[PDB]
Design an enzyme around this catalytic site. Structure first.
Site, PDB file in Angstrom:
ATOM      1  N   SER A   1      39.104  58.962  37.832  1.00 41.63           N
ATOM      2  CA  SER A   1      39.385  60.344  38.206  1.00 41.63           C
ATOM      3  C   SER A   1      40.846  60.501  38.622  1.00 41.63           C
ATOM      4  O   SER A   1      41.478  59.547  39.095  1.00 41.63           O
ATOM      5  CB  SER A   1      38.469  60.803  39.337  1.00 41.63           C
ATOM      6  OG  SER A   1      38.465  62.219  39.420  1.00 41.63           O
TER       7      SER A   1
ATOM      8  N   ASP B   1      58.322  58.019  39.291  1.00 35.03           N
ATOM      9  CA  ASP B   1      57.066  58.100  39.991  1.00 35.03           C
ATOM     10  C   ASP B   1      56.065  57.023  39.569  1.00 35.03           C
ATOM     11  O   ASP B   1      54.885  57.295  39.413  1.00 35.03           O
ATOM     12  CB  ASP B   1      56.469  59.510  39.879  1.00 35.03           C
ATOM     13  CG  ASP B   1      55.494  59.830  40.991  1.00 35.03           C
ATOM     14  OD1 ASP B   1      55.605  59.217  42.073  1.00 35.03           O
ATOM     15  OD2 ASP B   1      54.610  60.677  40.778  1.00 35.03           O
TER      16      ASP B   1
END
Ligand SMILES: Cc1cc(NC(=O)c2cccc(-n3cc(NC(=O)Nc4ccccc4)cn3)c2)ccn1
Length: 349
Positions: A28, A145
């Site tokens: 998820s 990131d």
């Protein structure tokens, strides 16, 4: 007749091509839900990610479009490669969801970090992360990131980076999800301007956590996170301060001063396999690399090429995987309708 079928996968409806069978949830995230499946056509296991109405807002749209575009610019064993892209919807007007298909991996790097890993496995994971980052940099992509939740591994210790990081421009989300910021470089935390070695800090953060089994720089937001960086590494030098915007410069210089812990204090011998002479030397090399990666000032931080040449990493070196031929550019604000069409035409190549 119908080339698609639908299944319920924990609230979410997965409408997929009939070739993909026995869907099971594996992950998820904000941008989508991920299933494992058997691909009857390729006779192999795959992971399928569902992007629900990725055009619904600017954040989801830029990312979905950028990543559909960039996956065609990149070709490296340590970077995500797509096996298939599809939408069950028949027209632009009907278009809702994008399904991305890739090789099924075995674990997320978060799971691997929780394990006690030998120096062979750790140095190999880091070497592959550096190869992937090198390849991205060669194709004009500075990630900014990189984080363990976006990195996957196989049982054979092979690794892939799943995303392409931050937009080259920028934001708001109604979703109750939080963005993990703990692996971001000081140049990102402090809005500074960056070069390729911004990604080295993130590798250092991951490597540090593999050794310490605790997030190195946690915090509610950048304020707490910056406090963690300076308490451990010490207040940066005056040379660093000069490259900061005047307002962030004032805040950084007016924070309490810290000498910072040395690297043997930061990462003691207790955290390392350091029984045999071989392990004693690898522990010394591992700490040396960490001391070159976890450097606040990017002017003094090790580069990707120099990290790849580091004694801890260079045992894996191979020219065929360190250099791969690197081969139009979007940076615009768009409405829902514009993004929906831009995405749809990428899906319908
Ligand atoms: C032999 C076997 C292995 C498993 N695997 C897992 O349990 C597992 C665990 C964590 C992560 C992954 N994994 C996650 C992806 N892809 C994405 O997360 N995101 C993504 C997908 C598609 C496109 C773009 C992006 C790949 N594998 C698998 C399950 C059953 N049998």
């Amino acid at each position: 007749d119908n080339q698609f079928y639908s299944v319920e996968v924990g609230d979410s409806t997965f409408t997929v091509l009939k070739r993909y069978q026995n869907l099971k949830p594996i992950g998820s995230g904000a941008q989508g839900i991920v299933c494992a499946a058997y691909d009857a056509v390729l006779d192999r296991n795959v992971a399928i990610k569902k992007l629900s109405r990725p055009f619904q807002n600017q954040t989801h749209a830029k990312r979905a479009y950028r990543e559909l575009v960039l996956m065609k610019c990149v070709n490296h064993k340590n970077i995500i490669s797509l096996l298939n892209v599809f939408t069950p919807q028949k027209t632009l007007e009907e278009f809702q969801d994008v399904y991305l298909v890739m090789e099924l991996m075995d674990a997320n790097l978060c799971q691997v970090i929780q394990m006690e890993l030998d120096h062979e496995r750790m140095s190999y994971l880091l070497y592959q992360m550096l190869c992937g980052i090198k390849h991205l940099h060669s194709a004009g992509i500075i990630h900014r990131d990189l984080k363990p939740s976006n990195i996957v591994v196989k049982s054979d210790c092979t690794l892939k980076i799943l995303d392409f990081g931050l937009a080259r421009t920028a934001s708001f989300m109604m979703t109750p999800y939080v963005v993990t910021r703990y692996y971001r470089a000081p140049e990102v935390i402090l809005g500074m301007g960056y070069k390729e070695n911004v990604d080295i800090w993130s590798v250092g953060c991951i490597m540090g956590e593999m050794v310490r089994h605790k997030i190195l720089f946690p915090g509610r937001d950048y304020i707490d996170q910056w406090n963690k960086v300076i308490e451990q590494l010490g207040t940066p030098c005056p040379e660093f301060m000069k490259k900061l915007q005047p307002t962030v410069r004032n805040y950084v210089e007016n924070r309490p001063k810290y000498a910072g812990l040395t690297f043997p204090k930061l990462f003691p011998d207790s955290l390392f396999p350091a029984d045999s002479e071989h392990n004693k030397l690898k522990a010394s090399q591992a700490r040396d690399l960490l001391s070159k990666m976890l450097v606040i000032d990017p002017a003094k931080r090790i580069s990707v090429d120099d990290a790849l040449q580091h004694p801890y990493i260079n045992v894996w070196y191979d020219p065929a995987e360190v250099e791969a031929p690197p081969p139009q550019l979007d940076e615009r604000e768009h409405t829902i309708e514009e993004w929906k069409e831009l995405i749809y035409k990428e899906v319908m190549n």
